Amino acid sequence: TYTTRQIGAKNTLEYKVYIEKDGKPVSAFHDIPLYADKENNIFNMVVEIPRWTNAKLEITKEETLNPIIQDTKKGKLRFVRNCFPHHGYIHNYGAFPQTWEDPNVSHPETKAVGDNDPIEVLEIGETIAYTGQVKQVKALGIMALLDEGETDWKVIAIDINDPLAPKLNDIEDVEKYFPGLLRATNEWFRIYKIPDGKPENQFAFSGEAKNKKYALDIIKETHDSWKQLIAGKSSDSKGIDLTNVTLPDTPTYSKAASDAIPPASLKADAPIDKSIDKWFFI
Amino acid sequence: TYTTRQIGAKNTLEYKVYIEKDGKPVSAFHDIPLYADKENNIFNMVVEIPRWTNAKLEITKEETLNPIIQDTKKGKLRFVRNCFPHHGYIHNYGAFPQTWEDPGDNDPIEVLEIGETIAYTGQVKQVKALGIMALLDEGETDWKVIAIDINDPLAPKLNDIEDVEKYFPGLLRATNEWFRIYKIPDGKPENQFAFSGEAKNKKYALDIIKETHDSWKQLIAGSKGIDLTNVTLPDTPTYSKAASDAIPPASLKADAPIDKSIDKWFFI
Ligand SMILES: [Mg+2]
Ligand SMILES: [Mg+2]
Ligand SMILES: [Mg+2]
Numbered sequence: 149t150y151t152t153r154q155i156g157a158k159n160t161l162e163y164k165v166y167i168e169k170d171g172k173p174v175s176a177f178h179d180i181p182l183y184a185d186k187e188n189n190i191f192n193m194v195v196e197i198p199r200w201t202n203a204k205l206e207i208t209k210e211e212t213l214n215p216i217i218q219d220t221k222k223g224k225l226r227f228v229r230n231c232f233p234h235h236g237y238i239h240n241y242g243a244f245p246q247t248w249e250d251p252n253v254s255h256p257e258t259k260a261v262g263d264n265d266p267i268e269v270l271e272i273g274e275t276i277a278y279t280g281q282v283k284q285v286k287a288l289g290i291m292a293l294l295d296e297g298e299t300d301w302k303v304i305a306i307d308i309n310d311p312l313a314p315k316l317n318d319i320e321d322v323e324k325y326f327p328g329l330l331r332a333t334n335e336w337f338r339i340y341k342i343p344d345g346k347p348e349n350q351f352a353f354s355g356e357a358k359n360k361k362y363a364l365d366i367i368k369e370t371h372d373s374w375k376q377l378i379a380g381k382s383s384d385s386k387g388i389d390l391t392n393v394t395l396p397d398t399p400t401y402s403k404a405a406s407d408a409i410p411p412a413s414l415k416a417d418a419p420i421d422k423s424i425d426k427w428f429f430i
Numbered sequence: 431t432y433t434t435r436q437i438g439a440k441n442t443l444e445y446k447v448y449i450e451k452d453g454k455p456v457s458a459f460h461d462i463p464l465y466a467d468k469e470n471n472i473f474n475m476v477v478e479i480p481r482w483t484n485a486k487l488e489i490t491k492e493e494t495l496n497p498i499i500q501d502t503k504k505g506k507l508r509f510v511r512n513c514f515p516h517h518g519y520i521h522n523y524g525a526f527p528q529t530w531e532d533p534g535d536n537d538p539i540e541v542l543e544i545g546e547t548i549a550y551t552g553q554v555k556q557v558k559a560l561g562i563m564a565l566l567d568e569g570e571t572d573w574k575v576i577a578i579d580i581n582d583p584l585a586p587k588l589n590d591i592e593d594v595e596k597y598f599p600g601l602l603r604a605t606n607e608w609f610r611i612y613k614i615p616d617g618k619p620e621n622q623f624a625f626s627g628e629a630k631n632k633k634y635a636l637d638i639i640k641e642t643h644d645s646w647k648q649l650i651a652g653s654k655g656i657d658l659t660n661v662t663l664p665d666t667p668t669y670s671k672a673a674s675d676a677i678p679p680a681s682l683k684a685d686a687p688i689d690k691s692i693d694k695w696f697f698i
């Protein structure tokens with residue numbers, strides 16, 4: 149059973165969330181199986197950012213066992229800004245573990261190198277998720293985002309426990325049950341860093357949401373990149389911490405790395421600066 | 431100085447917020463002057479509902495000193511549902527005190543405050559009026575004043591309704607949409623606007639505000655089941671300073687959980 153171990157107060161520099169199995173930390177990047185049910189293409193999603201929140205919480209590639217920590221921009225806590233008509237992130241946002249957008253090769257669909265992170269996941273179900281949650285999802289489709297010119301695919305997915313899950317099997321079903329969501333998703337990922345002073349992003353395929361079959365193919369590619377990475381065989385692993393506690397055939401296997409993690413020290417959420425309330429009209 | 435006194439846990443039937451002046455409860459309907467600066471048309475707004483929340487909190491006309499409580503229907507706490515692409519209420523939402531739509535919807539006139547900062551329930555902030563829309567909900571006229579906190583960084587650039595279009599492009603469209611559809615998930619019909627949903631200008635809004643203030647002047651001087659107790663207007667029949675002292679002390683209870691169903695995004 150997966151649980152979380154929180155260090156510190158949310159919305160601070162000291163905040164960390166480790167994922168635990170049997171009450172002991174494992175790598176959120178490496179040790180959670182991509183597949184909950186391989187035969188039925190049910191995936192484990194690691195949730196990073198709940199819907200309608202701002203704090204840019206992410207799996208930290210360079211820290212041992214890859215806890216979720218808030219990103220910083222020049223030393224300051226990063227919060228994604230509200231871009232009208234949206235409030236923070238408009239999906240439960242996270243990643244598939246055991247995947248990598250390989251930065252060392254140009255990807256043919258986008259003609260761009262990978263962004264060096266796990267493939268990311270937009271989970272569209274009704275219940276708001278929590279940071280460090282491992283939930284089980286079905287893939288519905290995928291969008292080819294170029295995030296500051298880097299390949300940054302976004303998988304469209306739904307929690308298998310969602311009341312609608314049985315009715316959502318491919319990307320066209322998203323438009324049927326969530327009309328406007330995919331178009332809003334396109335806008336969101338285009339504009340969300342404009343308030344940070346960054347350019348608009350762009351999508352390949354004029355932002356088309358490719359179907360499930362397409363999505364599975366790309367998820368496979370990223371899993372395969374990760375398999376090379378974790379084996380120590382990437383041409384450049386970018387100083388990623390490859391320490392893991394469940395993959396005995398890898399050079400960086402270490403069951404003991406788990407014991408070295410501090411105990412939970414959960415504190416109440418710290419206040420967020422009122423600037424983060426601001427609604428930007430772009 | 432205005433503060434708040436909270437009784438109970440948020441998101442419960444027991445929750446009440448009173449406004450305090452220098453530590454003493456006063457009526458949120460009657461004791462807060464409509465005008466912070468009459469000469470320059472600066473109004474006091476009583477905030478009921480923060481932007482991006484769901485709990486339908488309102489000044490209750492029928493309880494002494496008119497605390498803000500959660501609305502209910504047949505015993506059940508009311509939460510406005512999330513209507514895509516909106517998250518809860520899209521404005522800081524509240525009322526002008528010392529106003530009354532004499533039936534006409536029987537309530538103070540409501541205020542959509544459009545500034546950047548999210549407000550708090552029971553906050554008395556100072557705003558300038560920019561415009562007004564006339565919502566029709568169940569045969570009742572339901573005026574909504576568009577306003578901005580005078581402390582907002584943009585307040586000096588916003589003086590009339592056309593400035594909302596320039597600095598907040600799409601907000602007026604979203605407002606029209608929101609108030610049309612927000613009760614469809616509850617099983618209620620779509621609402622409609624007068625004037626084909628046009629936001630009338632500041633002048634038109636000031637005329638409505640003054641009118642509803644004149645009505646309330648009649649009300650408080652002595653009424654469909656409204657408690658008129660006040661603690662700051664000594665020559666009113668219902669003046670009673672002891673009312674302030676009869677209010678329980680603050681509870682410091684943490685917010686109660688809200689049922690997960692309220693998370694749901696409706697596509698309507
Ligand atoms: Mg980044
Ligand atoms: Mg990046
Ligand atoms: Mg990415």
Ligand SMILES: [Mg+2]
Pocket residue numbers: 501
């Ligand atoms: Mg009502």
Ligand SMILES: [Mg+2]
Pocket residue numbers: 535537540572573
């Ligand atoms: Mg009304």
